[PDB]
Swiss-Prot record, chains A, B:
Gene for this chain: Mpz
Post-translational modification: N-glycosylated; contains sulfate-substituted glycan.
Family: Belongs to the myelin P0 protein family.
Glycosylation: residue positions: N93
Native organism: Rattus norvegicus (Rat)
Coiled coil: none
Protein name: Myelin protein P0
Length: 115, 115
């Protein structure tokens, strides 16, 4: 029924930040759910997939902007699909969108890095 | 309040197809609205922007899969943001998403080309 993320998140260069994603429903829902995370850099319009989870298996992208900087920290049993973005860089600014499916429901969070 | 698109569209190779997008609201809404079209090929997870409209000006991508094959046919005055995909090819299969803003509201349509 509803997907949750933070509205904005601030991070320091060389530090890490966690991007929360979870979903809730008033009725029972099985653990056969998928989570997909997409990234759009500040001032761009393309949304690139950086992480995917389904049938109990996680898939991390090894080719893009956050390659070697993504950690899966969610739990499907708890309807949680959160990830951590590591070793922040100035150029990381942008909007991240979490897409939940059982067509999905999405929610976004914008990142700003300072220091 | 609501964004409309068709669920699926079928097209013949070497032919054209129109991708409808429109929005409606029970209350008055100004013509300061934007339309953005993104494309995800069949079996992929990346959504690439192929067209954008804002402040009365249309922007067509000249670098991607549908370069030289997009025509703007909408009217902002009528809350219509439709486009035509020209000279269809077998590989065009995929999902198109229309994003309407005044964070937006989205709706998608899936394309299948035969013959």
């Amino acid at each position: 029924i509803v997907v949750y993320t933070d509205r904005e998140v601030y991070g320091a260069v060389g530090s890490q930040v966690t991007l929360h994603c979870s979903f809730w429903s008033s009725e029972w829902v099985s653990d056969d759910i998928s989570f997909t995370w997409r990234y759009q850099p500040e001032g761009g319009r393309d949304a690139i997939s950086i992480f995917h989870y389904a049938k109990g298996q996680p898939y991390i992208d090894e080719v893009g902007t956050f390659k070697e900087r993504i950690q899966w920290v969610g739990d499907p049993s708890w309807k949680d699909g959160s990830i951590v973005i590591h070793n922040l860089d100035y150029s990381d600014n942008g909007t991240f969108t979490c897409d939940v499916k059982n067509v999905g429901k999405t929610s976004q969070v914008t990142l700003y890095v300072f220091e």
